[PDB]
Design a protein around this ligand. Structure first.
Ligand SMILES: [Ca+2]
Ligand SMILES: [Zn+2]
Length: 392
């Protein structure tokens, strides 16, 4: 039964865009419809965040905070100075100014969005010691995000998240294939990549780096430029955080809050080869992943990196082993779901037979009842007790 009235906030991964972008084709629902609308129609207040798809989790978390409470994005003086980008970003009205008076939210995050959600909770609760020290030493102002003491996230649910990274980044042609993936998602929305649309269509939100698609430039041309830009070559990127080493680094500081419920959902769309031990793409897996990514994910081993046979099962984009919660470089605890959703730990909800993009509806799958999946989840989140009492 309903135990809380906290709104749900949706958060995309390394692909993703606002509700008005992509001519209205939703990241959350894709060819299946509009998940946010379904939830609202069923009585679960739901909102959508749109942050830089290729940006670092840190940048995205600062953007999410501002988008939630309102104001001008502040990446932190220390951070900005370390990485060489602007300290201030775009300005937002604030989706939920209610959070500045004591409200809470549930975040449902897909792909990288799960790393961002975790980091947002960590910064909200603990702030950043490095930013506080830098403000004290240099007399710069400090965003409240870095002070600590905010407890506005009741839960975080991750779906297909590379908590321990994805080996996809280890492909020798990853740079070219990753951008081909962005082209594939544009294709899902019936948008061409070789056309210089005057409309923005898909905004990468690279204000901090000073990058934007120019007049006369197609997505193909733009992506060529992004490949040689700091959002692709620096460590302050989705590229880095998505990697196994980068994810491990993030895990070393981004911990589970004792005050928050965590739910993890894994995805797989593969079968095992009996003679090779490799994993292969199932029929119905999105066409891009099936040809370009899945074969590699299902066969790449790297002993010194710790990539063993457990990593081969995948959803076309991320290794299933990486999805139940952070493990590499992490102190977080993961407990298999048994009917009781425990606080301050990852409740491993298991593995679902769907593809990285099918789970959000960007790729079709008539056998996956997407509406039921999200409604069931919404019901579960609404049942969470904001305060648990100890008992026998
Ligand atoms: Ca499919
Ligand atoms: Zn940054």
């Amino acid at each position: 039964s309903r135990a809380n009235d906290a709104p749900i906030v949706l958060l995309h991964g390394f692909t993703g865009w606002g509700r008005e972008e992509m001519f209205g084709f939703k990241y959350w629902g894709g060819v299946r419809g509009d998940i946010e609308q379904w939830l609202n129609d069923n009585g679960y207040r739901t909102y959508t965040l749109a942050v830089g798809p290729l940006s670092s989790n840190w940048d995205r978390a600062c953007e999410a905070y501002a988008q939630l409470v309102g104001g001008t994005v502040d990446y932190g003086a220390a951070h900005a100075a370390k990485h060489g980008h602007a300290r201030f970003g775009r300005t937002y009205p604030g989706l939920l100014p209610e959070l500045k008076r004591g409200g809470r939210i549930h975040i449902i995050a897909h792909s990288q969005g799960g790393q961002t959600a975790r980091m947002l909770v960590s910064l909200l609760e603990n702030g950043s010691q490095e930013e506080r020290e830098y403000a004290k030493a240099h007399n710069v102002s400090l965003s409240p995000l870095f002070e600590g003491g905010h407890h506005f996230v009741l839960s975080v649910t991750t779906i297909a998240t590379p908590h321990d990274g994805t080996t996809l980044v280890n492909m020798v042609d990853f740079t070219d294939r990753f951008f081909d993936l962005q082209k594939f998602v544009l294709k899902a929305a019936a948008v061409a990549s070789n056309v210089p649309y005057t409309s923005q269509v898909y905004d990468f939100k690279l204000d901090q780096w000073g990058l934007r698609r120019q007049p006369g430039e197609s997505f193909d041309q733009y992506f060529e430029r992004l490949k040689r830009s700091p959002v692709w070559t620096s460590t302050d990127t989705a590229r880095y955080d998505l990697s196994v080493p980068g994810a491990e680094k993030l895990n070393q500081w981004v911990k589970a809050s004792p005050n928050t419920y965590y739910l993890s959902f894994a995805t797989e769309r593969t079968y095992r080869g009996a003679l090779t031990g490799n994993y292969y793409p199932e029929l119905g897996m999105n066409a891009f992943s099936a040809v370009v990514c899945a074969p590699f994910l299902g066969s790449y081993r790297n002993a010194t990196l710790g990539i063993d046979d457990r990593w081969l099962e995948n959803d076309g984009i991320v290794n299933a082993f990486s999805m139940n919660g952070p493990k590499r470089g992490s102190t977080d605890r993961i407990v298999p779901y048994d009917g009781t959703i425990k606080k301050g730990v990852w409740n491993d909800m298991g593995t679902y037979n769907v593809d990285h993009f099918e789970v959000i509806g960007v790729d079709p799958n008539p056998l996956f009842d997407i509406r039921a999946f999200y409604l069931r989840l919404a019901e579960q989140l609404a049942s969470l007790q904001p305060h648990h009492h100890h008992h026998h």
